[PDB]
Amino acid sequence: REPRLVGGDIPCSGRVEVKHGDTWGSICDSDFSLEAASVLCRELQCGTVVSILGGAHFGEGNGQIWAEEFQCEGHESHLSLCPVAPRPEGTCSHSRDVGVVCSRYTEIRLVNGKTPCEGRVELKTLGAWGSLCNSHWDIEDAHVL
Amino acid sequence: AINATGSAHFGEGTGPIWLDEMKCNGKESRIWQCHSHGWGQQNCRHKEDAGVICSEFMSLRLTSEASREACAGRLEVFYNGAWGTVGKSSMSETTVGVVCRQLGCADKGKINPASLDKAMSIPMWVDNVQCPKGPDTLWQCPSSP
Numbered sequence: 003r004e005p006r007l008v009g010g011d012i013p014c015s016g017r018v019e020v021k022h023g024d025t026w027g028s029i030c031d032s033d034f035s036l037e038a039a040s041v042l043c044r045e046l047q048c049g050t051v052v053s054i055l056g057g058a059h060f061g062e063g064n065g066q067i068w069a070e071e072f073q074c075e076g077h078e079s080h081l082s083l084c085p086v087a088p089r090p091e092g093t094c095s096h097s098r099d100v101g102v103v104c105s106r107y108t109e110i111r112l113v114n115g116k117t118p119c120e121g122r123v124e125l126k127t128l129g130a131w132g133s134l135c136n137s138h139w140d141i142e143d144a145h146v147l
Numbered sequence: 148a149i150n151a152t153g154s155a156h157f158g159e160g161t162g163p164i165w166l167d168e169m170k171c172n173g174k175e176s177r178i179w180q181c182h183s184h185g186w187g188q189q190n191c192r193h194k195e196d197a198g199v200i201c202s203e204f205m206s207l208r209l210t211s212e213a214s215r216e217a218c219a220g221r222l223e224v225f226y227n228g229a230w231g232t233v234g235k236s237s238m239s240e241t242t243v244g245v246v247c248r249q250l251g252c253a254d255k256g257k258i259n260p261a262s263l264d265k266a267m268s269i270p271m272w273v274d275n276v277q278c279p280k281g282p283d284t285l286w287q288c289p290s291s292p
């Protein structure tokens with residue numbers, strides 16, 4: 003069970019697509035719960051689920067849509083270990099694709115520094131790149147970066 | 148069958164659910180042969196349970212003007228989804244006692260003549276009831292067909 007997020011400009015927000023070993027397929031909204039979404043953000047290294055958006059808000063998914071329904075405890079590391087329950091085929095359509103917005107949305111990089119690990123801090127927000135202010139920037143911030 | 152009871156009306160079962168969405172033509176001899184989603188596959192819970200009321204389900208009560216159930220009144224028996232009276236022929240003291248003890252009114256009892264008012268003039272289901280010594284319930288006493 004390999005999940006991924008597509009169709010989103012935000013780094014940790016997009017439409018849910020689960021790979022069943024070889025094929026990529028979308029997930030219907032009625033088959034996704036809060037516990038399953040929390041596992042998906044954790045597996046994708048995005049931290050915490052913020053919202054669950056149905057109706058193909060992030061992007062009209064293509065390909066097949068699986069009728070598998072996730073019955074998730076909530077503490078599973080991956081979607082693969084989470085028990086699921088099959089359903090009769092053809093239950094859901096394309097217009098009800100599930101979307102997930104996780105927490106880790108900020109993107110920061112270091113540029114123009116000769117070393118890849120050293121450089122001025124640049125942060126992208128509202129569709130533009132810019133340089134972070136030095137004021138109130140200290141060693142604790144630097145270590146996390 | 149006369150009724151198919153749902154929503155755990157009869158009771159709540161603790162065992163795991165074995166079948167889901169049973170579709171049967173009604174003529175198959177064994178319950179297994181009917182179509183289902185899969186053996187041991189389910190999406191319900193224990194709160195949903197299936198009950199059945201068969202044709203030969205018998206209950207006993209006394210009908211009176213004041214109350215539907217009373218310690219004195221007309222004797223009624225329930226069979227094949229219908230209520231029926233019982234004839235007075237071959238009536239015995241032991242049979243009267245067994246009727247009273249089954250419904251928890253008294254130990255012995257007595258037969259009073261017919262009252263002035265009778266409800267709906269329901270038919271007779273059984274006649275010539277002869278009760279031996281020993282059976283607490285009326286179902287064990289021989290009678291006419």
Ligand SMILES: *[C@@H]1O[C@H](CO)[C@@H](O)[C@H](O)[C@H]1NC(C)=O
Pocket residue numbers: 149150
């Ligand atoms: C059984 O079905 C009959 C016929 O529909 C109905 O009158 C009766 O109320 C039902 N009994 C129960 C207990 O559901």
Ligand SMILES: [Ca+2]
Pocket residue numbers: 167168190191
């Ligand atoms: Ca079902």
Ligand SMILES: [Ca+2]
Pocket residue numbers: 168169170171
């Ligand atoms: Ca059926």
